[PDB]
Paper text:
The physiologically important protein [name] is an evolutionary conserved enzyme that belongs to the ubiquitous and ancient α-d-phosphohexomutase superfamily, and it is encoded by the [name] gene. [name] is a key regulator of carbohydrate metabolism in mammalian cells, catalyzing the reversible conversion between α-d-glucose 1-phosphate (G1P) and α-d-glucose 6-phosphate (G6P) via a bisphosphorylated sugar intermediate, α-d-glucose 1,6-bisphoshate (G16P). Isoform 2 of human [name] encodes a protein comprising 580 residues, and it differs from isoform 1 by having a longer and different N-terminal. Here we present three crystal structures of the isoform 2 variant of [name], both as a free enzyme and in complex with substrate and product.
Finally, the complex structures have strong densities for G1P and G6P in their active sites. Only minor differences can be seen when comparing the free protein structure with the complex structures, with D4 rotated 2° or less in the complexes, compared to the free protein structure.
Author numbering: 6 to 480, 483 to 580
The structure:
């Protein structure tokens, strides 16, 4: 009971704050999605976690750090609870005034972005490796968000890397034990300090659910998913963090059956499966959808910022299309009614399906590089309201992270509005704006410098006067513009180069080659292919059949097979 903990704290007295010596590491550079390593890096290596955490604290100014509030939460993967305890003790020893932590450490990435902005916190620490597998032999990550609720920009992350490279002492409160299970306030008496330290354990779902409740019309959702004539659906949480949100939001408040949700219990190893939503890693969901029983299926990733949208019989609306449908009927969501369409954005590898809705509605569209930085830059300038990434990313400017369950609720709102099946909505959209046949091949973990050699030699081949205008086909395309995609940010003036080789032809079709920044050992080659078609006779056809020429040209030009040794892609989406 609470009384036992209170009396215990009273008898043990004030908790000491102590400095301990440490040695720095070399690979604590936070990437596009924080700092991600294998779990043993954080669980077994001495003071790895402590070094990184204290680097994060040092990256925050002392003024903003004394007395301020910080959100802490994660996707409930292995080691998250222990690392959260360490974060609590260090925060207590580092002048933080209050930690708002999700119950049992559970807090989806959009939930953290939401709470940060709501409680006016100086930032948040997210214990997630996103779509990467968890468990003792899995992966583990730490993502630092700032006061706008979004990821820490390159300045902050670089400061954390620099500080981490030379750090030699940290502060911790080792006698501090905190129960992450019981909701409510939890105060701690610290030695040599006058103000008590506060750990507030909040519901993992409540605030997020309130935000969705003010974004969507939950009456229409209740009538759609709740009644006897309900729209049969199946939501696969992949044993990820979105489980509690699915159950408390869609099932409890919105009234959909409890057997509508599956795998809605977050497991520290994500049930052994890969917490990534796509047709390859969500086989159970597509095969359950293959019997012709539900009209809408959806999957999420580990931390809840990605989503997969499926229709009846397993119909697959690829992310690049999903964001274009949401844009095409964006005014079915009360939130965008309130804000208006501030702008549209997509990453360069993402198909141009959104571009067509932007051109038809006279709305600015920004083709940004891979990553959140540019999307947040645009959102803070009131120049972006809906954005999406091909990597199953969909989000708006309601927060500063992408949001999977938000995209699902948007799809249910537009389903209830248009009163059609997903396949009908998609087909009508294709005939309305034309179809962007899209595919992406991932060649996972190939020996680098073979891939880098393919990129350098490929780019040299692309910049040649005897290249622009050359004929290719496999029973015809002619090169129009080959380059290394550069992007100038129109908000802060930042310039970004490489970002992926582009082959654009005269029919609008594009072949993009990108080296991954998500990877650990070696390198991952990503091949995107995007071909447009308006001839409504050709709007419907098998995309892997419709695209096969462009694929053959992509590997024949890149010499992928001869330089990597691989004969088939690791995953096709
Ligand atoms: O490995 P990549 O391609 O560099 O990065 C990948 O993970 C990132 C973080 O989720 C996403 O923003 C990218 O869209 C995705 O392509
Ligand atoms: Zn994610």
């Amino acid at each position: 009971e609470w009384i036992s903990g209170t009396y215990r704290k009273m008898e043990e007295g004030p908790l000491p704050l102590l400095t301990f010596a440490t040695a720095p590491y070399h690979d604590q550079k936070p990437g596009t999605s924080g700092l991600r390593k294998k779990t043993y890096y954080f669980e077994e290596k001495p003071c790895y976690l402590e070094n990184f955490i204290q680097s994060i604290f040092f990256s925050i100014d002392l003024k903003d750090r004394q007395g301020s509030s910080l959100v802490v939460g994660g996707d409930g993967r292995y080691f998250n609870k222990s690392a959260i305890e360490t974060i609590v003790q260090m925060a207590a020893a580092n002048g933080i005034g209050r930690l708002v932590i999700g119950q049992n450490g559970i807090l989806s990435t959009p939930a953290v972005s939401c709470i940060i902005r709501k409680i006016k916190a100086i930032g948040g620490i997210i214990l997630t490796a996103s779509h990467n597998p968890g468990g003792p032999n899995g992966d583990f990550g730490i993502k630092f968000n700032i006061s706008n609720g979004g990821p820490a920009p390159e300045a902050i992350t670089d400061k954390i890397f620099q500080i981490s490279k030379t750090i030699e002492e940290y502060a911790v409160c080792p006698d501090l034990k905190v129960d992450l299970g019981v909701l409510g306030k939890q105060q701690f008496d610290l030695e040599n300090k006058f103000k008590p330290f506060t750990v507030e354990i909040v519901d993992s779902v409540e605030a997020y659910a309130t935000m969705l409740r003010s974004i969507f019309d939950f009456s229409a959702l209740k009538e759609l998913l709740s009644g006897p004539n309900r729209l049969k659906i199946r939501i696969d949480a992949m044993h990820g963090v979105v489980g509690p949100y699915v159950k408390k939001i869609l099932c409890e408040e919105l009234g959909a059956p409890a057997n509508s949700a599956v795998n809605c219990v977050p497991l520290e190893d994500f049930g052994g499966h890969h917490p990534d939503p796509n047709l390859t890693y969500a086989a159970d969901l597509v095969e359950t959808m293959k019997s012709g029983e539900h009209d809408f299926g959806a999957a999420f990733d580990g931390d809840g910022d990605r989503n997969m949208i499926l229709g009846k019989h397993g119909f697959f609306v690829n992310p690049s299309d999903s964001v274009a449908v949401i844009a095409a009927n964006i005014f079915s969501i009360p939130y965008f009614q309130q804000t208006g369409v501030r702008g549209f954005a997509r990453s360069m590898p993402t198909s141009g399906a959104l571009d067509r809705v932007a051109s038809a509605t006279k709305i600015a569209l920004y083709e940004t590089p891979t990553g959140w930085k540019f999307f947040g830059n645009l959102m803070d300038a009131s120049k972006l309201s809906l954005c999406g990434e091909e990597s199953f990313g969909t989000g708006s400017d309601h927060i500063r992270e992408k949001d999977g369950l938000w995209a699902v609720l948007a799809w249910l709102s537009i389903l209830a509005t248009r009163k059609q099946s997903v396949e009908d909505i998609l087909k009508d959209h294709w005939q309305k704006y034309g179809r962007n046949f899209f595919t992406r091949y991932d060649y996972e973990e190939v020996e680098a410098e073979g891939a880098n050699k393919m990129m350098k030699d490929l780019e040299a081949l692309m910049f040649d006067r005897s290249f622009v205008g050359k004929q290719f086909s496999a029973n015809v395309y002619t090169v129009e513009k080959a380059d290394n995609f550069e992007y100038s940010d129109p908000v802060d003036g930042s310039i970004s180069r490489n970002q992926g080789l582009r082959l654009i032809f005269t029919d609008g079709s594009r072949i993009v080659f990108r080296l991954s920044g998500t990877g650990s050992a070696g390198a991952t080659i990503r091949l995107y292919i995007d071909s447009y078609e308006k001839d409504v006779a050709k709007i419907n056809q098998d995309p892997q059949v419709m695209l096969a020429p462009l694929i053959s040209i992509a590997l024949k030009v890149s010499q992928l097979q001869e330089r990597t040794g691989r004969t088939a892609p690791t995953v096709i989406t």
